[PDB]
Nucleic acid binder design. Structure first.
Ligand SMILES: C[C@@H]1Cc2cc(F)cc(C(N)=O)c2O1
Ligand SMILES: [Zn+2]
Ligand SMILES: [Zn+2]
Lengths: 222, 456
DNA sequence: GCCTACCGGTTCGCGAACCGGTAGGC
DNA sequence: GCCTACCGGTTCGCGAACCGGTAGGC
């Protein structure tokens, strides 16, 4: 959908379009989506985050133009936002929300790499299956949905198509199939969901849940 | 089908088939939301895979020799199911999420004007250009004959869209039919998204496309065939295929003056965008059209009326006569349902020739259409069954050719008078329409060739 | 009757090699 | 669309070593 794309390198395999060296794993990298000559589909032209700003591209507002911006770590978002460039109650709720937005961002990130330290992928796969959740393709995406599951709740099936809703940037988009020919287009900020049920098998669940985690709903960007 | 020349082994090894089922399938997949609109041709010559975005250089291919012939079946049926979702044999096909869907592939002794008539109606490259504006795939549609059952389903999808549009159905409902249609009929939009079939005239435009596309494949069916023996001339071979007796009415003839009067007189005051100019008059006599029309020579109120259509259609109109729209097709565009439409004015009919400043010449018909006891209508109304005793329908217009100046012709009433006000003015039509719901009621008399003079 | 240097054959341990399914790359 | 580097899971190959049977010496 978007022209650009930013994420942490899912593998240290892809090369950089400008300098032509291997972009290392788990490193901040940016892309520009182009039409592939080989097949009918868009393809990311990966750049080193350093090399991205010398090709001549100037993203005015990263949060609205670049994809995967909200999924980044809070301090890394500010690096993109700054590098892109180179009343009382109104400002209070505005400022206090950004406090709660950071609070939510690095809460999930603390929870994400906590599970990466303790649990293997197969544990995280069987975590989602137990909660009646579709197991996604990808390592990063699995713990992203487990962390989403634990903090907010196990997502109930879709109203019409009975598919799996997934958090994407600014809302929960339905990824199911209303029919064989077309994909479902349900979208919401307040989806239906029961409470996340961790199985008995968790000797470090008391440690992860002890990180000051209370009941709260997903907060979104302005 | 034959071998795809993208392999490079087209005139070397034949495409294989196991008894009945031919090991060759051309798949397609479109998602209007994503914008993807792709093809995937699979063959078994060696196995050959072709893929990309339909109607563009985007894509690639892989020719690959097999270890053996039984390994070919293994590699073919596996690749097939991996891409399409289903097995190679099936009773009825079923589409699967993000999987592909298979498309169902199958010295001349005559006058100079008559030779030009064949020259005009059998130039198929002119018919190809005609489809370019519709955005039909130009690449492999002439060699790749799209199936008859396929096009009927494509018609059915269009008729489902109009039904969905009429009663303001869901966007998903519309999205599906738009996806379904462009999958079933491969279009060329280049690098931009296939547009949603949401309008009332968008379905009509795509309905007209199928009607024209059909007649081109019919024009091919005539051209390809016969008995290639060294005796007759090339133009004569195509003349005999038309299955009609065409004659040139001389300009000095007294009946020719009537037609030129009928052209000059019955030009519409509102259609002042162009000016007609009769190049030729052809007297036309179809094979056994008098045998089927004998019944309706007993019928009263017979009128010699205009009927225009694309120069591409006249290849099929001569061979099969004037035909009613199929039952699968949508009723959109038609004022009073599916049937043969006629006009008393040459101009109103002449618009259906679809001529431009670059393509000046155009063909229009004159048929002795047995109207009989007429069912007169003012406003548009999609009828299924006619009222009792009625053999035709009439759309009453504001302007009508003078009924006190209606000249006769071989026992046929020719209304070649100039325009005056009608009896009733509570209608939503400006000019008259004459509709017959039976191909037997029409009998084509004259074929004209008209030059259009615009001002640009 | 002992002891023991020598030999054929089975087991054991551990890293190389193999492999099918797949997430990431273009 | 297809290619391929990566992952875990099992097998495979080969030398150390373990072990029982034995025949030359005293
Ligand atoms: C089928 C359309 C509707 C219509 C009305 C009419 F008065 C004339 C024509 C025509 N084909 O000349 C026509 O073609
Ligand atoms: Zn670089
Ligand atoms: Zn849904």
């Amino acid at each position: 959908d978007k022209l650009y794309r930013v994420e942490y390198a899912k593998s240290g395999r892809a090369s950089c379009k400008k300098c032509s060296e291997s972009i290392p794993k788990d490193s901040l990298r940016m892309a520009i989506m182009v039409q592939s000559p080989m097949f009918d589909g868009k393809v990311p032209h990966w750049y080193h985050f350093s090399c991205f700003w010398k090709v001549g591209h100037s993203i005015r507002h990263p949060d609205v133009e670049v994809d995967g911006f909200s999924e980044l770590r809070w301090d890394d978002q500010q690096k993109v936002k700054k590098t892109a460039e180179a009343s009382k109650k109104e400002k209070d709720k505005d400022s206090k929300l950004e406090k709660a937005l950071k609070a939510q961002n690095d809460l999930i990130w603390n929870i994400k790499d906590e599970l990466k330290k303790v649990c293997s992928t197969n544990d995280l796969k069987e975590l989602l299956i137990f909660n009646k959740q579709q197991v996604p393709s990808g390592e990063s995406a699995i713990l992203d949905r487990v962390a989403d599951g634990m903090v907010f709740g196990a997502l109930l099936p879709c109203e019409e198509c009975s598919g799996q809703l997934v958090f994407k940037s600014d809302a929960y988009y339905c990824t199911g199939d209303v029919t064989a020919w077309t994909k479902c287009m349900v979208k919401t900020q307040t989806p239906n969901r029961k409470e996340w049920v961790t199985p008995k098998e968790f000797r470090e669940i008391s440690y992860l849940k002890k990180l000051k985690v209370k009941k709260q709903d997903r907060i979104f960007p302005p | 089908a034959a071998v795809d020349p993208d392999s490079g082994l087209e005139h070397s090894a034949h495409v294989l088939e196991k008894g009945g089922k031919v090991f060759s399938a051309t798949l397609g997949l479109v998602d209007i939301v994503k914008g993807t609109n792709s093809y995937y041709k699979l063959q078994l010559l060696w196995i050959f895979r072709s893929w990309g975005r339909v109607g563009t250089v985007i894509g690639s291919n892989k020719l690959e020799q097999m270890p053996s012939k039984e390994d070919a079946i293994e590699h073919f049926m596996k690749l097939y199911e991996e891409k399409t979702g289903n097995a190679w044999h099936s009773k009825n096909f079923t589409k699967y999420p993000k999987k592909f869907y298979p498309l169902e592939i199958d010295k001349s002794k005559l006058p100079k004007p008559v030779q030009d008539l064949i020259k005009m109606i059998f130039d198929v490259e002119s018919m190809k250009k005609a489809m370019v504006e519709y955005e039909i795939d130009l690449q492999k549609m002439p060699l790749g004959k799209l199936s008859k059952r396929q096009i009927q389903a494509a018609y059915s999808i269009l008729s489902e869209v109009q039904q969905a549009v009429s009663q303001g159905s869901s966007d998903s409902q519309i999205l599906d039919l738009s996806n379904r249609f462009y999958t079933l009929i491969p279009h060329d939009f280049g690098m931009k998204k296939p547009p949603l079939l949401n309008n009332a005239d968008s379905v009509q435009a795509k309905v007209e496309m199928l009607d024209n596309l059909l007649d081109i494949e019919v024009a091919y069916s005539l051209l390809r065939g016969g008995s290639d023996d060294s005796s007759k001339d090339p133009i004569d071979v195509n003349y005999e295929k038309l299955k009609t007796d065409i004659k040139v009415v001389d300009r000095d003839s007294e009946e020719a003056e009537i037609i030129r009067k009928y052209v000059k007189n019955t030009h519409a005051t509102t259609h002042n965008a162009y000016d007609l100019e009769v190049i030729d008059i052809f007297k036309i006599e179809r094979e056994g059209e008098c045998q089927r029309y004998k019944p309706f020579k007993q019928l009263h109120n017979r009128r010699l009326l205009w009927h225009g259509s694309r120069t591409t259609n006249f290849a099929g109109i001569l061979s099969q006569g004037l035909r009613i729209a199929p039952p699968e097709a949508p009723v959109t565009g038609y004022m009073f349902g599916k049937g043969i439409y006629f006009a008393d004015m040459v101009s109103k009919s002449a618009n259906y020739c679809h001529t431009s400043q670059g393509d000046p010449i155009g063909l229009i018909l004159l048929g002795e259409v047995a109207l009989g006891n007429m069912y007169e209508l003012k406003h548009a109304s999609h009828i299924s069954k006619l009222p009792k005793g009625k053999h035709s329908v009439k759309g009453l217009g504001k302007t009508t050719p003078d009924p006190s100046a209606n000249i006769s012709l071989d026992g046929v009433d020719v209304p070649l008078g100039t325009g005056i006000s009608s009896g009733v003015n509570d209608t939503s039509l400006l000019y008259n329409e004459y509709i017959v719901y039976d191909i037997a009621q029409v009998n084509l008399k004259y074929l004209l060739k008209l030059k259009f003079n615009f001002k640009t």
